[PDB]
Symmetry: C7
């Protein structure tokens, strides 16, 4: 399953982030990708990233949720700090892990 997991990680492991504190946001695609990857690095739990190398989990199953909030310190960098984000494979990996 871990091999299939790394196929998912390479192909479709993407998250999408939009700012919360204040609907156009006047951010370009480069800024959007930068914010997404920053929130992936800081907000998403390390289990999501480390799962495909693997193939204590009792707390891990309930640890990760679908939608997340990250207070990424890009104030004066993108104009916002609080960002709400989501990623489609959250529930997919949750079901996989409940099966796994």
């Amino acid at each position: 399953i871990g091999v299939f997991g790394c196929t998912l990680q390479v192909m479709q492991d993407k998250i999408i982030c939009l700012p919360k504190r204040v609907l156009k946001t006047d951010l370009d695609l480069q800024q959007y990708s930068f914010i997404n990857q920053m929130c992936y690095e800081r907000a998403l739990h390390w289990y999501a990233k480390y799962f495909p190398y693997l193939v204590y989990n009792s707390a891990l199953v309930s640890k990760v949720q679908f939608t997340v909030d990250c207070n990424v310190d890009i104030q004066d960098m993108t104009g916002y700090k609080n960002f709400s984000c989501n990623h489609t494979m959250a529930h997919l990996f949750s079901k996989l892990s409940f099966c796994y």
Copy 2:
């Protein structure tokens, strides 16, 4: 069939959503993708996602429809809550399942 089902799930399984309560919507592509995946996670029935892993269905056949509505709580996030959505694989998978 289930292998074919996960093929369609990987390649062409996207839904499209547009707001209802009030034609430009001044929403960028990132916002559109975020709304699409949010409504896919919330509005779309779990059978649509879980079909390719399997390969009680009597109510499940009539459960889903082509066009759906999601009242996704993204106020001050994208500016709208009610979103009308559709995806091409709705009727396709309905026909496949009636055959299946």
Copy 3:
């Protein structure tokens, strides 16, 4: 032929729809794709979709045409209801079927 037909279905089976009642239309690509799939589900005849699963046809050959009109109920949703649409494989599939 039916395998070839589903090849054209997956790769190049695309239709394009433009509003009729009143040349920019101030519609984004997401709205265009939504209208395309909506009219594909509604206006396009079920034979066009169901041809590659088979592989009464006397009425089917003259049933469909190249250009179509759909009065899709997207008023206050996209701003127009009447849409004229066309798709390239219409005449191609008509020729195939006349051969087939």
Copy 4:
């Protein structure tokens, strides 16, 4: 040859159309593609499309030319009727046919 021809018509059989009667034209990419396929269906001679199924030609060789004009009736639909169009496959397939 005909197999090669079907390869080209899948990959590079694209025509481009621009309106004649009156340099921005304020037409979106969807409208451009719609006009392209419309004029391809109406203006381009059936020999160009039907060549890869074959593999009387004396008139066919001089029948088609590189650039074409189509008076496609999309007035109040895209804003123009007369369109000048061209595709790179015209002279290439003419040379192929002269060889063939």
Copy 5:
């Protein structure tokens, strides 16, 4: 070599054209591609196209150059007639032919 030549022809044989007589030019991508193919058909010498079918050349080697000028009659069509153009295969195929 001719097989390799037709490989570069299918993948990378693209030319770029810009108008001369008078830096934004307010031409869309469709118009740019149309001008590119028009000047490719007109300005570029038939050796560039016909090389990969082959595999008198003494003057033919010095015939073509990297950049070209073409006065394509697209007045009231794109707004300019004189276009300076260049393609990536010019010096590459010149070296290939000097070797060949």
Copy 6:
């Protein structure tokens, strides 16, 4: 591992850079890519680049960090000198190296 490392280097070795000293920045995609390449060359340590040719590291493991600052002299070229940059594979390669 080093072969896999060069697979990542070819596929997904990308960085994103945003200006620091003062949220739109009115920089095009070409300028964004140029800034990314500059800061990838000057800010990213040579070990990140040279890892896939190898396959003293005690200081090298703690040498690099996820987010970096790059002070590149493109003033009057893109309008800014200080940029903050990040790349996806920083943590992945740090974990790989710690395992390695």
Copy 7:
């Protein structure tokens, strides 16, 4: 190595150019590609292109540098003559050549 070198030349041998004498530059992507190819043809040393055909080099190793300045005569064509340009394979091929 030369086979690998021509793989890089086909895939990722691209350069980026921005004007120097005077941050938006109001140049479209077609103009950007045209400027890039012009400067690649004139500025980049013939060794960079001719390396994958071979596979006197003592001066060649120090001959080229990563960033270049090229004074391309497209005044009244794109609005600028002086351009600073870069290409990603500079340091990579310099290391390869020092090894080779």
